[PDB]
Design a protein around this nucleic acid. Structure first.
Lengths: 117, 50, 100, 93, 55, 50, 211
RNA sequence: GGUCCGGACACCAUGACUGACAGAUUGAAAGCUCUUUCUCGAUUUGGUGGUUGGUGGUGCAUGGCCGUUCUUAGUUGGUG
């Protein structure tokens, strides 16, 4: 399912809909379809804070423990001609305003995260 | 990391905005106005409110 | 109606060749052709200092370009003009038709 | 140069669509005659960056930059803007 | 700010509002018939434009 | 008639303010300006300009 | 549009001059020779006379397509209104511009100046020219500049027949020491068929009909 | 006097970094700077290489062009 998420947010970023500072404003507009979060965020006030707005605005979330993987999950790192993740940055939170690739997997993950919540 | 400073988490679970939100026709919710000594300044716009 | 053929050029030989071709076409078709009307030639003169600096004797280049114009008056409602105009062409001469 | 991502997007889209691009050496013009939205300075700097990275061939004549897309450029541009591999610029067609 | 100060001064007339179409120079500019060529530009481009030295 | 410019109006306002915020006994604070084409109007008499 | 005939002629001349400059800067390695502009009201055809039409066109006519699109965009034409044809110059040896570019290529390559200009002289003379004059000026040997002139055949300098019989070209070469100027002058042969040279004989050449 | 980087590209990094209300400031409605904290968010910012620009020097390093020697009749091979 990580592959499906990656395929979706790749096209999201290409369309320039992929988004902390930007994510808050995105889910304030409610154009967010979902938010991906990390459990490695040491900030106790931020960790709960983000899901407060997510739940309030009815934008369920997906949690992936560590942040370097979500940092890789954007295409923002440079590759050694093989997709080699290099020099990734923490992506504690993110938002997807517009849908992306992997249409079938996108439908699958929408149903998944709408049913399990 | 001042993003968390414009949000108050009530003990029950919901949140309340700690900064006067902007009301410009284009930029609305999300974007906040500065807490200047006597005024409040839109960052995304001018919209100075005293 | 009166069709006005105006031919303009910077060289006399091609312009006269095109004029003669058009007159020949009109005569062959048996049309009411009005002879080539020769407009006064327009002389555009540019006099410039030869040197790219301010030194030396004051010598001047007198460049000039000449423009020659010809008019042809036709009384031709039929489809013949397109034929006559299309057949005769020549580089350096620009032609245009007006429905006077 | 500091250029908005959307501005770079329009520049790159036009470049890929046409295969060529012309820009007067006028850093002050606020409207590139063929590309809308972006300014002549932004177009000039974007395509100068492309030439520096060897994705575009550059020529100059009479205060007019002329730029032609290369094969490295088409590969990079298709990858960047995420088009299907079947689409190609009008020049190649 | 920068937006209204970079080129605030008008350039609608005078030598600074024009330039040769090849070297972008403000000096000795021919404007007859819209040539917009410096006196050095024209001496080189005259044959191509169509200007001959008859006499 | 062609219209004084915004910098000129700002200079007029600055000089008037300086004159107002000064007692008759003392002289108003110097107002420095590059505007050598400004007209000297009755709003201007009494001040001191660099 | 509505424009005076004087301005129309001037605009045509300016367009031709700019096109010639741009093409000589672009297709120099292509053996560019010249350009003819036929700006009919409907379409504007542009003939690019070069020595290597293959290279000018490029792979499946891609370079020519790029050039026509670029010219259209630069000069504000309508898509498909301006169009380029390539053309192969009959006698490359009688074209001064092509010979000047070849000499430029040899000099940038590193051939000795004497050898290169003598080879060009021999080729031009064998191509049928009445006379040839090649001048190379600049920092050829040492710090102080000098000009080397090579002349073969007969060449005219003064009078109107110069315009008809003499073909000249000038170019520059940027070497480590500086700029070197190349001048090539070729006296075309009297060609009654009007292909290799002027159709009319020299004004002072009286030819006798044998009885 | 003041402002902008319009310092490409490459490499090495450390919400990177833009912008503007109002007071002060300035010749200045210049967010230039200092008070103030808002806002776009990988384009930037710092350093190292490398570029880029210059009506900066050198016309006694040069190209091209022009002037002059020189508006006079003067000049050059090939074979002897």
């Amino acid at each position: 399912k990580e592959g499906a998420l990656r395929a979706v947010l790749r096209a999201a970023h290409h369309a320039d809909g992929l988004a902390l500072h930007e994510t808050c404003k995105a889910l304030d507009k409610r154009e967010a379809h979902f938010c991906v979060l990390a459990e490695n965020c040491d900030e106790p006030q931020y960790v709960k804070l983000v899901e407060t707005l997510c739940a309030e605005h009815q934008i369920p979330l997906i949690k992936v423990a560590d942040k370097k993987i979500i940092g890789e999950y954007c295409g923002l790192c440079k590759y050694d001609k093989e997709g080699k993740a290099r020099k990734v940055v923490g992506c504690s939170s993110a938002v997807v305003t517009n849908w992306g690739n992997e249409e079938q997997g996108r439908a699958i993950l929408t149903d998944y995260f709408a049913s399990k919540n | 990391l001042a993003v968390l400073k414009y949000y108050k988490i009530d003990e029950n679970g919901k949140i309340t905005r700690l900064r006067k939100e902007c009301q410009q026709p284009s930029c609305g919710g999300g974007v906040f106005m500065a807490q200047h000594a006597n005024r409040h300044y839109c960052g995304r716009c001018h919209d100075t409110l005293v | 109606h009166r069709i006005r053929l105006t031919l303009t050029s910077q060289n006399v030989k091609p312009l006269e060749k095109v004029c003669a071709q058009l007159i020949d076409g009109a005569k062959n078709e048996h049309l009411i052709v009005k002879g080539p009307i020769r407009m006064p030639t327009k002389v555009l003169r540019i006099t410039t200092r030869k040197t790219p600096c301010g030194e030396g004797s004051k010598t001047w280049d007198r460049f000039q370009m000449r423009i020659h114009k010809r008019l042809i008056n036709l009384h031709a409602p039929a489809e013949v003009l397109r034929q006559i105009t299309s057949i005769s062409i020549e580089p350096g001469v620009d032609i245009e038709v007006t429905r006077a | 140069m500091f250029i908005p991502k959307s501005h770079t997007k329009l520049i790159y889209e036009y470049l890929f669509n046409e295969g060529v691009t012309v820009a007067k050496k006028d850093f002050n013009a606020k409207t590139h005659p063929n590309i809308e939205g972006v300014s002549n300075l932004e177009v000039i700097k974007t395509l100068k960056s492309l030439a520096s990275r060897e994705l575009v061939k550059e020529q100059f004549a009479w205060r007019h930059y002329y730029w032609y897309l290369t094969d490295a450029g088409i590969l990079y541009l298709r990858e960047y803007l995420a088009l299907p591999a079947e689409i190609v610029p009008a020049t190649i067609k | 700010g920068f937006q209204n100060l970079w080129f605030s001064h008008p350039r609608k007339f005078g030598p600074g509002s024009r330039s040769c179409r090849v070297c972008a120079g403000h000096h000795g500019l021919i404007r007859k018939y819209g040539l917009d060529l410096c006196r050095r530009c024209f001496r080189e481009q005259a044959r191509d434009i169509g200007f001959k030295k008859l006499d | 008639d062609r219209g004084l410019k915004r910098k000129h109006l700002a200079l007029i306002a600055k000089v008037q303010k300086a004159k107002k915020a000064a007692g008759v006994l003392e002289k108003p604070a110097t107002v420095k300006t590059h505007l050598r084409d400004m007209i000297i109007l009755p709003e201007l008499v009494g001040g001191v300009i660099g | 549009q509505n424009v005076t005939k004087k301005k129309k002629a001037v605009i045509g001349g300016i367009f031709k001059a700019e096109l010639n400059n741009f093409l000589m800067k672009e297709l120099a390695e292509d053996g560019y020779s010249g350009v003819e502009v036929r700006s009919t009201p409907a379409r504007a055809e542009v003939i690019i006379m070069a020595t290597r039409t293959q290279n000018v066109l490029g792979e499946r006519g891609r370079r020519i397509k790029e050039l026509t699109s670029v010219v259209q965009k630069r000069f504000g034409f309508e898509e498909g209104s301006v169009e380029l044809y390539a053309e192969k110059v009959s006698n490359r040896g009688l074209c001064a511009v092509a010979q000047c570019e070849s000499l430029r290529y040899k000099l940038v390559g590193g051939l000795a100046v004497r050898r290169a200009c003598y080879g060009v002289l021999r080729f031009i003379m064998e191509s049928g020219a009445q006379g040839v004059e090649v001048i190379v000026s600049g920092k050829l040997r040492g710090q102080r500049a000098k000009a080397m002139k090579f002349v073969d055949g007969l060449m005219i300098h003064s009078g109107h027949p110069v315009n008809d019989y003499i073909q000249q070209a000038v170019r520059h070469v940027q070497l480590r020491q500086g700029v070197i100027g190349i001048k090539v002058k070729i006296m075309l042969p009297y060609d009654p068929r009007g292909q290799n040279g002027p159709r009319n004989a020299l004004p002072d050449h009286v030819q006798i009909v044998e009885p």
